[PDB]
Amino acid sequence: SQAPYLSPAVPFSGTIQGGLQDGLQITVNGTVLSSSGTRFAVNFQTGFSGNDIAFHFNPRFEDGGYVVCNTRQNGSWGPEERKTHMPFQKGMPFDLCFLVQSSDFKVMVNGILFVQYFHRVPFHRVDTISVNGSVQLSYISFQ
Numbered sequence: 647s648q649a650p651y652l653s654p655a656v657p658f659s660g661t662i663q664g665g666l667q668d669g670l671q672i673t674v675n676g677t678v679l680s681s682s683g684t685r686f687a688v689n690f691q692t693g694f695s696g697n698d699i700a701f702h703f704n705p706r707f708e709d710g711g712y713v714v715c716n717t718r719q720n721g722s723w724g725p726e727e728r729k730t731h732m733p734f735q736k737g738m739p740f741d742l743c744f745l746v747q748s749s750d751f752k753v754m755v756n757g758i759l760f761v762q763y764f765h766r767v768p769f770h771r772v773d774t775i776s777v778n779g780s781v782q783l784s785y786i787s788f789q
């Protein structure tokens with residue numbers, strides 16, 4: 647059991663001890679800022695560069711509110727999967743939970759399953775979580 651990151655500053659990048667494993671649950675607890683921009687992202691990536699992001703989870707308070715899910719490989723973005731629902735709210739606290747499964751990530755927001763994202767690259771290669779944009783973080787916890 648890895649220790650939680652408590653009140654990490656954004657932008658944040660942090661090691662996932664042992665990498666993503668089938669059954670690992672990562673919790674991101676925080677607050678979407680009220681008036682500090684219109685997007686944030688949680689990135690599950692290989693190392694610290696961010697050129698290789700297995701899963702980019704990117705809520706955008708733009709064009710009615712939607713969430714982009716995508717993968718970056720060797721610096722190139724793939725085809726976006728957009729969920730045209732926004733489960734977050736500017737100025738409001740959230741609990742965001744990611745469950746790593748064999749074929750996909752399951753993402754719950756505030757106790758409710760929000761989206762799944764099927765793996766495009768091997769998940770075992772992911773050892774870093776990064777968070778950027780319009781968000782303040784209280785904690786990131788593991789397992």
Ligand SMILES: CC(=O)N[C@@H]1[C@@H](O)[C@H](O[C@@H]2O[C@H](CO)[C@H](O)[C@H](O[C@@H]3O[C@H](CO)[C@@H](O[C@@H]4O[C@H](CO)[C@H](O)[C@H](O[C@@H]5O[C@H](CO)[C@@H](O[C@@H]6O[C@H](CO)[C@H](O)[C@H](O)[C@H]6O)[C@H](O)[C@H]5NC(C)=O)[C@H]4O)[C@H](O)[C@H]3NC(C)=O)[C@H]2O)[C@@H](CO)O[C@H]1O
Pocket residue numbers: 657659685687689694695696697702704714716723726778779
């Ligand atoms: C309808 C349609 O088709 N529309 C599309 C749009 O959807 C599309 O928009 C793009 O869509 C994609 C998803 O598909 C994505 O949302 C794009 O957004 C960009 O995404 C990236 C990743 O989240 C952002 O770039 C990253 O930003 C952060 C800060 O916010 C950093 O700057 C990242 O760079 C890394 O920074 C690290 C931390 O500082 C650094 O690591 C550090 O290095 C230090 C030493 O130098 C030290 O060691 C330290 O300890 C260490 O942590 C990394 O080295 C550094 N990496 C690199 C490569 O230098 C950066 O990667 C980006 O901010 C974000 N942009 C926006 C606007 O949100 C989104 O643009 C568009 C465009 O494709 O096309 C339309 O058609």
